[PDB]
Amino acid sequence: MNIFEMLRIDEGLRLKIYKDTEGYYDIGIGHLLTKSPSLNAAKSELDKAIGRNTNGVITKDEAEKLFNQDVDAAVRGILRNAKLKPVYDSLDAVRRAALINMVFQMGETGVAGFTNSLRMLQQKRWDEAAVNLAKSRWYNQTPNRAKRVITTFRTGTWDAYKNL
Ligand SMILES: [Cl-]
Ligand SMILES: [Cl-]
């Protein structure tokens, strides 16, 4: 299992513009196009992202390309963020993948806001961090997904994902 495989399980794969859990427009493997309510705004961002008149549809390759850019950007965003980098550098490989998952999902800014949890993770207080992470809108909105990432941070293993 690796980050790619992990996120591909959590986000799925759709080749046509779709609404995410929050009502925004995405395409591919959780690639956010626009937060705006217009399908046109979305088709426009989409063609601009792919570099061609897509007409709301892309291929698998195209989806994977966006995905690759999105993971890379997540990592790069963690590394340039003053609150995140330290956390990330203190973690083992599996748990680093759990932090990238939350960043890809919610943005660097969103994550950096989990101040108390970040500190606990940094301290290696697994169970405490898990309980703290759970007290969030994130967990309440997408509990199944949240449970997987939290277990990942709690255990340092890919158990929540083996079987999927
Ligand atoms: Cl893009
Ligand atoms: Cl969920």
UniProtKB/Swiss-Prot annotation:
GO molecular function, one term: lysozyme activity
Top-level taxon of origin: Viruses
Keyword field contains Zinc: no
Keyword terms of this UniProt record: Antimicrobial, Bacteriolytic enzyme, Cytolysis, Glycosidase, Host cell lysis by virus, Host cytoplasm, Hydrolase, Viral release from host cell
Reactions catalysed, as given in the entry: Hydrolysis of (1->4)-beta-linkages between N-acetylmuramic acid and N-acetyl-D-glucosamine residues in a peptidoglycan and between N-acetyl-D-glucosamine residues in chitodextrins
Gene Ontology CC annotation, any one: host cell cytoplasm
Cellular localization per UniProt: Host cytoplasm
pH-dependence of activity, as noted: Optimum pH is 7.3.
Effect of N132I: 5-fold decrease in enzymatic activity
Induction, per UniProt: Expressed late in the viral replication.
InterPro entries in the record: Endolysin_T4_type, Glyco_hydro_24, Lysozyme-like_dom_sf, Lysozyme_dom_sf, Phage_lysozyme-like, T4-type_lysozyme
A single BP term in Gene Ontology: viral release from host cell by cytolysis
EC number(s) per entry: 3.2.1.17
A Pfam family reported for this protein in Swiss-Prot or TrEMBL: Phage_lysozyme
Active-site residues per Swiss-Prot or TrEMBL entry: E11 (proton donor/acceptor), D20 (proton donor/acceptor)
Enzyme class: hydrolase
Family under the similarity heading: Belongs to the glycosyl hydrolase 24 family.
Purpose of the protein: Endolysin with lysozyme activity that degrades host peptidoglycans and participates with the holin and spanin proteins in the sequential events which lead to the programmed host cell lysis releasing the mature viral particles. Once the holin has permeabilized the host cell membrane, the endolysin can reach the periplasm and break down the peptidoglycan layer.
HAMAP family tied to this protein: ENDOLYSIN_T4
Protein name in UniProt: Endolysin
Gene: E
